[PDB]
Amino acid sequence: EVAIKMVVVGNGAVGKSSMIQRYCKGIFTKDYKKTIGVDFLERQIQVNDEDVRLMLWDTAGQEEFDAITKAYRGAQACVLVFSTTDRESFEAVSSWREKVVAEVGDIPTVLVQNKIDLLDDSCIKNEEAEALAKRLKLRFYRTSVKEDLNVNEVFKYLAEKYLQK
Ligand SMILES: Nc1nc2c(ncn2[C@@H]2O[C@H](COP(=O)(O)OP(=O)(O)O)[C@@H](O)[C@H]2O)c(=O)[nH]1
Ligand SMILES: [Mg+2]
């Protein structure tokens, strides 16, 4: 049995709260802004013959970039999220990465481009997202929380890397 605290980080409106609700509750609602009224949601899964309890902590956006918060404290893995339709959220990734490393150190991390169902309206070229992932040395996923596309894979990857580097 292992419990893993995972923090989901990135600019406002990229889909962090939706991603957590999708993974832990299996829902996607039509609201302009999602809310999680508790510190974290959780999902208990089996990974490589071990029982893992994933505790997914939501965060605030760039308006709280300098904030030192409970969601980051003792985080054991991290999802860095930007949005297909928000170039500023992509440009912010390196700053979010540096913030997490300075607060918790080196923890398993993945880079996620969410809202890939909106590719027609993309503001990020595929080559530049892949180039950033290679520069930060991070596994990169293109996700659609709305379509339940690659969400499960993100958390499974992080749990496996926590268990075996
Ligand atoms: N089309 C699309 N909309 C999404 C996706 N994920 C989230 N959204 C929407 O993006 C908006 C912001 O999502 P939210 O989870 O509140 O973002 P947060 O501010 O990062 O927590 C909401 O209207 C969500 O329904 C996605 O994969 N595709
Ligand atoms: Mg939110």
Author numbering: 7 to 78, 80 to 172
From the primary publication:
Rab23 is a member of the Rab family of small GTPases. It plays crucial roles in Hedgehog signaling, ciliary transport, and embryonic development. As a member of the Rab GTPase family, Rab23 acts as a molecular switch by cycling between the GDP-bound inactivated (OFF) state and the GTP-bound activated (ON) state. The structures of the hRab23 in complex with GDP or GMPPNP revealed a typical small GTPase fold of the Ras and Rab family proteins, containing six β-strands and five α-helices.
Like the WT hRab23 protein, the Y79del mutant of hRab237-172 copurified with GDP, as evidenced by clear observation of the electron density of GDP. This observation suggests that the Y79 deletion does not abolish GDP binding. The switch I loop of the hRab237-172 Y79del-GDP structure adopted an opened conformation, similar to that in the WT hRab237-172-GDP structure. The switch II region of the GDP-bound hRab237-172 Y79del, however, exhibited a different conformation relative to that of the WT hRab237-172-GDP structure. The switch II region of the hRab237-172 Y79del mutant was more ordered than that of the WT Rab237-172 structure. The partially disordered region (residues 67–70) observed in the WT hRab237-172-GDP structure formed a 310 helix in the hRab237-172 Y79del mutant structure. However, in the hRab237-172 Y79del-GDP structure, the residues corresponding to the α2 helix in WT hRab237-172 formed a random coil instead of an α-helix, suggesting that the loss of Tyr79 potentially disrupts the secondary structure of the said region. On closer inspection of the mutation site, the loss of Tyr79 resulted in Tyr78 being repositioned to take the place of Tyr79 in the hydrophobic pocket while neighboring Ala77 moved to the original (WT) position of Tyr78. Notably, the occupation of Ala77 in the original position of Tyr78, which is a residue in the hydrophobic triad, potentially altered the interaction surface with binding partners. However, the hRab237-172 Y79del mutant in the presence of Intu–Fuz did not show a significant decrease in luminescence signals (78.2 ± 2.4% relative to buffer control) compared to hRab237-172 Y79del alone (83.5 ± 11.5% relative to buffer control). This observation suggests that the GEF-stimulated nucleotide exchange activity of the hRab237-172 Y79del mutant is impaired.
